[PDB]
Enzyme design. Structure first.
Site, mmCIF file in Angstrom:
data_model
loop_
_atom_site.group_PDB
_atom_site.id
_atom_site.type_symbol
_atom_site.label_atom_id
_atom_site.label_comp_id
_atom_site.label_asym_id
_atom_site.label_seq_id
_atom_site.Cartn_x
_atom_site.Cartn_y
_atom_site.Cartn_z
ATOM 1 N N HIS A 15 0.706 -1.276 0.000
ATOM 2 C CA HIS A 15 0.000 0.000 0.000
ATOM 3 C C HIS A 15 0.729 1.319 0.000
ATOM 4 O O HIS A 15 0.090 2.352 -0.042
ATOM 5 C CB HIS A 15 -0.971 -0.032 1.199
ATOM 6 C CG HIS A 15 -1.924 -1.187 1.162
ATOM 7 N ND1 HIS A 15 -2.692 -1.461 0.055
ATOM 8 C CD2 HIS A 15 -2.193 -2.166 2.060
ATOM 9 C CE1 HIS A 15 -3.389 -2.567 0.266
ATOM 10 N NE2 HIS A 15 -3.105 -3.018 1.472
ATOM 11 N N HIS A 128 -3.483 -3.024 8.125
ATOM 12 C CA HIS A 128 -4.333 -3.284 6.970
ATOM 13 C C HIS A 128 -4.989 -2.030 6.474
ATOM 14 O O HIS A 128 -5.234 -1.077 7.239
ATOM 15 C CB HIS A 128 -5.347 -4.437 7.223
ATOM 16 C CG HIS A 128 -6.701 -4.024 7.718
ATOM 17 N ND1 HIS A 128 -7.709 -3.564 6.892
ATOM 18 C CD2 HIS A 128 -7.220 -4.030 8.967
ATOM 19 C CE1 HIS A 128 -8.785 -3.300 7.614
ATOM 20 N NE2 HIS A 128 -8.516 -3.572 8.877
#
Ligand SMILES: [Fe+3]
Length: 133
Positions: A15, A128
Site C-alpha cells: 500500500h 491493513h
C-alpha cells in the site's frame, strides 16, 4: 501474508508507493511473493511515517470490518493508484494484467501494536488498509 514480513511490512509493500509505475508493472512487487495474482490493490502515494501518524487520529469503526474500532481516517485526501486485475482466471503471477485507476481519496487504516520483528521506532503501525473514501 508471506511469513517473512510483519503485518506492517506487508502493508507497506502493498500500500505505500510514492511514484508507482503502471499497475501491471507495479503489482509485480507484490505478486512475486504470492502464488496467485491480487484481484485488487490500492497504492497510497505517501510514506510509511505518514501512515503511522494517521494511526494517531481518532479511533473509528472500520467501514469494511464493522466489529472493529481500531481504524483511523486520514484528515486529507491523498493521491493514490488503484489496480484491478483484468484476468482473474490467471493461474501464474507472470500473466497478471491490471487496469489503472488513479484518484485522490481519504484512506482508512487499521493500526495495532507492532510485531516484535518491526522497528522500535514505531510502536503502533498500520496493519491493513480498510478502505478509501
Ligand atoms: Fe486468491
Amino acid at each position: 501474508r508471506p511469513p517473512q514480513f510483519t503485518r506492517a511490512q506487508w502493508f507497506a509493500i502493498q500500500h505505500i508507493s510514492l511514484n508507482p509505475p503502471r499497475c501491471t508493472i507495479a503489482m509485480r512487487a507484490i505478486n512475486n511473493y504470492r502464488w496467485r495474482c491480487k484481484n485488487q490493490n490500492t497504492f497510497l502515494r505517501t510514506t510509511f511515517a505518514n501512515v503511522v501518524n494517521v494511526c494517531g487520529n481518532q479511533s473509528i469503526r472500520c467501514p469494511h470490518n464493522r466489529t472493529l474500532n481500531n481504524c483511523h481516517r486520514s484528515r486529507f485526501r491523498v493521491p493514490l493508484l488503484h489496480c484491478d486485475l483484468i484476468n482473474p482466471g490467471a493461474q501464474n503471477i507472470s500473466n497478471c494484467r491490471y487496469a489503472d485507476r488513479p484518484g485522490r481519496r481519504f484512506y482508512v487504516v487499521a493500526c495495532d501494536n507492532r510485531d516484535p520483528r518491526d522497528s522500535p521506532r514505531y510502536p503502533v503501525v498500520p496493519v491493513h488498509l480498510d478502505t478509501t473514501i
